[PDB]
Design an enzyme around this catalytic site. Structure first.
Site, PDB file in Angstrom:
ATOM      1  N   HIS A  99      67.292  21.788  72.833  1.00 16.03           N
ATOM      2  CA  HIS A  99      68.259  22.162  73.883  1.00 16.03           C
ATOM      3  C   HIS A  99      69.277  20.983  73.919  1.00 16.03           C
ATOM      4  O   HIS A  99      69.289  20.152  73.009  1.00 16.03           O
ATOM      5  CB  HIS A  99      67.497  22.375  75.233  1.00 16.03           C
ATOM      6  CG  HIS A  99      68.162  23.317  76.232  1.00 16.03           C
ATOM      7  ND1 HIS A  99      68.392  24.657  75.977  1.00 16.03           N
ATOM      8  CD2 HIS A  99      68.456  23.136  77.551  1.00 16.03           C
ATOM      9  CE1 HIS A  99      68.783  25.250  77.086  1.00 16.03           C
ATOM     10  NE2 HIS A  99      68.832  24.353  78.052  1.00 16.03           N
TER      11      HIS A  99
ATOM     12  N   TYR B 291      61.045  18.259  79.648  1.00 16.65           N
ATOM     13  CA  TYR B 291      61.064  18.140  78.199  1.00 16.65           C
ATOM     14  C   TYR B 291      59.946  17.200  77.710  1.00 16.65           C
ATOM     15  O   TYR B 291      59.380  16.445  78.493  1.00 16.65           O
ATOM     16  CB  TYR B 291      62.413  17.592  77.712  1.00 16.65           C
ATOM     17  CG  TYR B 291      63.666  18.334  78.132  1.00 16.65           C
ATOM     18  CD1 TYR B 291      64.032  19.546  77.534  1.00 16.65           C
ATOM     19  CD2 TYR B 291      64.569  17.745  79.020  1.00 16.65           C
ATOM     20  CE1 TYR B 291      65.299  20.145  77.799  1.00 16.65           C
ATOM     21  CE2 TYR B 291      65.832  18.327  79.294  1.00 16.65           C
ATOM     22  CZ  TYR B 291      66.201  19.518  78.675  1.00 16.65           C
ATOM     23  OH  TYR B 291      67.500  19.987  78.851  1.00 16.65           O
TER      24      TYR B 291
ATOM     25  N   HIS C 295      67.535  27.135  71.871  1.00 16.56           N
ATOM     26  CA  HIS C 295      67.634  27.902  73.106  1.00 16.56           C
ATOM     27  C   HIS C 295      68.730  28.975  73.104  1.00 16.56           C
ATOM     28  O   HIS C 295      68.543  30.047  73.679  1.00 16.56           O
ATOM     29  CB  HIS C 295      67.800  26.984  74.317  1.00 16.56           C
ATOM     30  CG  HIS C 295      67.262  27.575  75.585  1.00 16.56           C
ATOM     31  ND1 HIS C 295      65.940  27.932  75.730  1.00 16.56           N
ATOM     32  CD2 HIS C 295      67.863  27.886  76.756  1.00 16.56           C
ATOM     33  CE1 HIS C 295      65.747  28.436  76.937  1.00 16.56           C
ATOM     34  NE2 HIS C 295      66.899  28.418  77.581  1.00 16.56           N
TER      35      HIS C 295
ATOM     36  N   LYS D  51      72.911  31.048  77.035  1.00 16.56           N
ATOM     37  CA  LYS D  51      73.535  29.727  77.144  1.00 16.56           C
ATOM     38  C   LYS D  51      73.877  29.091  75.789  1.00 16.56           C
ATOM     39  O   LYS D  51      73.481  29.598  74.737  1.00 16.56           O
ATOM     40  CB  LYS D  51      72.644  28.783  77.956  1.00 16.56           C
ATOM     41  CG  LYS D  51      72.553  29.107  79.443  1.00 16.56           C
ATOM     42  CD  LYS D  51      71.891  30.447  79.711  1.00 16.56           C
ATOM     43  CE  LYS D  51      70.483  30.484  79.152  1.00 16.56           C
ATOM     44  NZ  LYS D  51      69.624  29.393  79.688  1.00 16.56           N
TER      45      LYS D  51
HETATM   46 HG   LIG Z   1      72.973  22.252  76.445  1.00 13.87          HG
END
Ligand SMILES: [Hg+2]
Ligand SMILES: [Hg+2]
Ligand SMILES: [Hg+2]
Ligand SMILES: [Hg+2]
Ligand SMILES: [Hg+2]
Lengths: 149, 774
Positions: A16, A45, A121, A127
């Site tokens: 990510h 994370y 992701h 996103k």
């Molecule tokens: Hg990001």
């Protein structure tokens, strides 16, 4: 000091990317603050890679995290410091020293979890994380901005 | 999180309780559990007929709920805010859940506002609402000392669901207010007071009823009751203790929102569930001989007339329960936790109440007392009278010196009344009984009365261990080997000694007269010496001293010497503080250390440099050694008042407590870290000790009353060893304050804020193992 349950298995390894600019040398400390504010007992994370090159360890490797949702129960998340232009949108501006770090980490993890798959992701989410085409960077040392791959 | 049908669900609980404790009981548990929402046509008919309070309010209420049901329905243009809400709920429940809740709420001599009472009833209707079916079905499964704890054998359809309600707070209020209204009209039970607030008054009719006459609260029991089969072991964070799938699950931790409760879910911590669960299996039973007395004796200003009218409904609520299970060979109590750690027992009637409740109960499984037991039983009963300051040896005596008096209480009502004159009448009377039976069956009897013991202070204890100072660890009376002597008294001498010393013989620092003319006892230098948390530095001693001894002496004209007030108090404070700062050094040291981390942890980044240097005023969290996570986040409320003029007349416009869109309250956040942390500790010591006294010394029954715990006399002696050894094991296995250091340091700003206070220096404490008798 707070401990979380263990994933009964590790099937994916996600990358990510904070929405921070090249002037912010943030790390686990800072990323955890966000999260505490996001309401959590600890960073979501497992590893996080500073603009520097430094790989700071987050939650215990083998622990249910809070990174990729509907997937937290079985995968390792890696947040790359950086990934947003000086006031604008996604921009693969990660450091080359920061990409080698991700390279060696990734080989290690993929070797230590036979079967485990490398993902992104923006491959299961509306996103732009990690904000760059991964499979291209992986298969070719070519790092390009994008929201595919 | 639904996996099986609304039937397998209505199955498993019963089919596990049947396969387990046995079939007659599997049906007695659930039957009992359903009593929270609806009584029943069975229990009701055999009660109504058989007697050709409670057969009055119920009939009349179900009525109104039915008249009104269709009155609205006149099919005209306006639907009230509570109609679809009440509608698919069987009024059978409605009228019950309403009578049942409204009385429970009048228990509180604290708050009883239409808003409170109304919202209380509100929450219930919804539980029923959401669990009214799985329940109705589960019932059909039929007509209206075993250790049943298991650690995996629970069918995966017994694993607790949603503990939090969904309805909007406002709504919940309207629904409750209509039930409250329909209650007043069909049965003039309660009435509004100071209309324009207090729904707590009970008409002068039902008032005298409940207090005066023969046991009216017959069919009206508390929403939460004791079990008749082992509770259910917890796992996960909801649905434990109880079995009925047709009900609203309990929550591991009592939080202030489902969001807060939800952050435990992913957390791994075995010892917490071990502890909670061990504490839950403890078998109990009613002490009938004490009950027999309480049964009769309980029948024989403006600011303290409110408690009288409410302590009565509570007396009755808990004498209706004690009698209810008076014969059960045993009973259990599911347990819960605070956001800070504490274990609370869910049911209203529990071993954690006034002394009458405390006495009406007793462990249901005993061992032979023998020499030691019988000793500690004595020490116990002394403390029960009030002789708990003096030392143990002269503590024993008081008892033999009163042998024939305790015995005399073998005819409790006939002019014994001696026990009643003790600090805690029933928490003592029970004692005599026990005492007597030893004096009749000998040191061979399996006695089981829970013996509890409280310490002069815990915190001044853990800090002394943590830091490793003697002088104070020995002052408390519990860390190293010594001759039990109170600290409260110790701090007294140092106050006086100093007074004369250099006050007289050394503005007005010549107050060593005002006080010496009045007297400085250990009864004046103790209230503060135990407030080393919320109540703090000398400044906090002033208002307590000024509030406890001085002012209350001027009221009765016993302080003539204190010409100048405040200044008197302030003078003593300086004295209390200097005396404490010498008696228990580490405790004060450890408390500043936290008062200091408190400034940082809850601050806002102090760079004015304007760049990547900000740190929101946010939550503060920390973890106890057994693994339990504590999240403190005091939010300033955001609310907007309502408007209700519904009872024909009487306009009411209460303030909706809050709407959940808050911003931190930096004051509380900072002033609440030290104290909430210490309470946090007490929790984590207890839990640890209970687990340790169940493995290391295999004890089975645990009594926990306001952070004092005891077992049967047989085992009494080992708890102590258990306690002593857990302390040791904790502070030897690591440096907890160093850990907490890192723990806090971890929540600050890069380095900016890394202006952390230095950890206090450790002292010299005899080899921790010196802490135990050896
Ligand atoms: Hg990001
Ligand atoms: Hg209430
Ligand atoms: Hg007692
Ligand atoms: Hg006994
Ligand atoms: Hg205390």
């Amino acid at each position: 000091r707070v401990q979380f349950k263990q994933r009964e298995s590790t099937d994916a390894i996600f990358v990510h990317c904070s929405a921070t600019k090249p002037s912010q040398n943030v790390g686990v400390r800072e990323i955890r603050q966000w999260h505490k504010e996001q309401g959590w007992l600890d960073v979501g994370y497992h590893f996080i890679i500073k603009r520097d090159g430094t790989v700071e360890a987050g939650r215990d490797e083998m622990a249910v995290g809070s990174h990729a949702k509907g997937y937290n129960h079985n995968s390792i998340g890696v947040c790359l410091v950086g990934g947003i232009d000086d006031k604008g949108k996604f921009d693969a501006n990660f450091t080359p020293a920061q990409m080698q770090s991700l390279r060696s980490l990734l080989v290690t993890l993929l070797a230590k979890y036979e079967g485990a798959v490398l993902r992104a992701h923006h491959e299961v989410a509306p996103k732009a994380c990690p904000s760059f085409d991964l499979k291209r960077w992986w298969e070719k040392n070519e790092l390009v901005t994008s929201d595919r791959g | 999180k639904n996996d099986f049908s609304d039937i397998e669900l209505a199955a498993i609980p019963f089919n596990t309780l049947a396969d387990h404790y046995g079939e007659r009981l599997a049906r007695e548990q659930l039957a009992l559990e359903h009593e929270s929402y609806e009584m029943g046509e069975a229990r009701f008919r055999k009660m109504f007929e058989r007697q050709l309070l409670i057969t009055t309010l119920l009939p009349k209420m179900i009525a109104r709920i039915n008249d009104w049901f269709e009155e609205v329905k006149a099919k005209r243009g306006k639907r009230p805010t509570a109609f679809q809400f009440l509608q698919e709920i069987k009024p059978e429940a409605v009228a019950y859940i309403t009578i049942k809740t409204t009385l429970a709420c009048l228990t509180s001599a604290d708050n009883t506002t239409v808003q409170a009472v109304a919202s209380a009833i509100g929450r219930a209707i919804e539980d029923e609402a959401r669990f009214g079916r799985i329940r109705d079905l589960e019932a059909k499964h039929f007509k209206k000392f075993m250790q049943v704890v298991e650690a995996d054998m629970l069918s995966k359809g017994l694993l607790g669901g949603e503990a939090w309600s969904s309805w909007h707070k406002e709504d919940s209020i309207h629904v409750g207010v209509r039930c409250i209204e329909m209650l007043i009209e069909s049965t003039g039970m309660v009435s509004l007071h100071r209309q324009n607030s207090e729904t707590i008054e009970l008409a002068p009719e039902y008032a005298e009823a409940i207090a005066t006459r023969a046991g009216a609260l017959a069919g009206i029991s508390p929403m939460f009751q004791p079990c008749v089969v082992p509770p259910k072991p917890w796992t996960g964070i909801t649905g434990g203790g109880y079995w009925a799938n047709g009900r609203r699950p309990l929550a591991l931790v009592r939080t202030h929102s489902k969001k807060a409760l939800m952050r435990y879910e992913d957390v791994y911590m075995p010892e917490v569930y071990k502890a909670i669960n061990i504490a839950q299996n403890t078998a109990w039973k009613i002490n009938k001989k004490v009950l027999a007395v309480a049964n009769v004796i309980t029948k024989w200003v403006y600011r303290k007339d409110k408690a009288r009218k409410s302590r009565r409904i509570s007396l009755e609520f808990m004498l209706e329960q004690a009698n209810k299970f008076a014969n059960h060979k045993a009973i259990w109590f599911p347990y819960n936790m605070d956001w800070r750690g504490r274990v609370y027992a869910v049911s209203m009637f529990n071993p954690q109440g006034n002394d009458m409740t405390k006495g009406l109960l007793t462990l249901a499984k005993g061992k032979p007392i023998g020499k030691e037991g019988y000793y500690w039983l004595k020490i116990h009963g002394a403390n029960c009278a009030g002789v708990d300051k003096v030392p143990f040896p002269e503590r024993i005596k008081f008892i033999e010196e009163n042998h024939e008096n305790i015995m005399a209480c073998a005819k409790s009502p006939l002019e014994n009344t001696w026990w009643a004159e003790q600090d805690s009448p029933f928490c003592f009377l029970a004692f005599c009984f026990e005492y007597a039976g030893v004096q009749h069956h000998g040191l061979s009897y399996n006695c089981s009365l829970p013996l509890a013991f409280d310490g002069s202070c815990s915190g001044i204890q853990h800090f002394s261990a943590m830091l490793r100072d003697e002088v104070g660890g020995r002052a408390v009376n519990l860390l190293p080997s010594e001759t039990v002597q109170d600290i409260y008294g110790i701090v007294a001498k140092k106050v006086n000694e100093i007074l004369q010393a250099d006050a007289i013989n050394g503005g007005t620092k010549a107050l060593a007269g005002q006080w010496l003319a009045y007297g400085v006892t250990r009864s004046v230098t103790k209230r503060s010496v135990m407030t080393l948390a919320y109540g703090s530095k000398e400044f906090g001693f002033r208002q307590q001293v000024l509030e406890d001894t001085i002012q209350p002496a001027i009221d009765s004209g016993k302080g003539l010497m204190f010409t100048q007030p405040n200044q008197a108090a302030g003078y003593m404070a300086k004295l209390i503080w200097e005396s404490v700062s010498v008696t228990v050094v580490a405790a004060v040291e450890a408390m500043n250390w936290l008062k200091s981390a408190a400034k940082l942890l809850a601050a806002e980044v102090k760079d004015k440099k304007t760049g990547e240097i900000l740190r929101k005023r946010s939550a503060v969290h920390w973890v106890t050694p057994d693994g339990f996570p504590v999240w403190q986040e005091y939010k300033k409320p955001i609310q907007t008042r309502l408007n209700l003029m519904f009872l024909g007349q009487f306009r009411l416009q209460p303030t909706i407590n809050t709407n959940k869109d808050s911003e931190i309250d930096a004051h509380k956040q900072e002033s609440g870290i030290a104290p909430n942390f210490v309470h946090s500790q007490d929790g984590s010591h207890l839990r640890k000790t209970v687990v340790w006294a169940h493995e290391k010394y295999g004890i089975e029954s645990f009594a926990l009353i306001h952070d004092s715990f005891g077992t049967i006399p047989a085992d009494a002696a080992n708890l102590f060893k258990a306690v002593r050894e857990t302390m040791v094991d904790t502070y030897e296995s690591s440096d907890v304050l160093a850990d907490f250091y890192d723990q806090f340091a971890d929540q600050l700003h890069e380095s900016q804020l890394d202006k952390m206070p230095a950890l206090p220096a450790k002292g010299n404490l005899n080899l921790r193992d010196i802490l135990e008798s050896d």
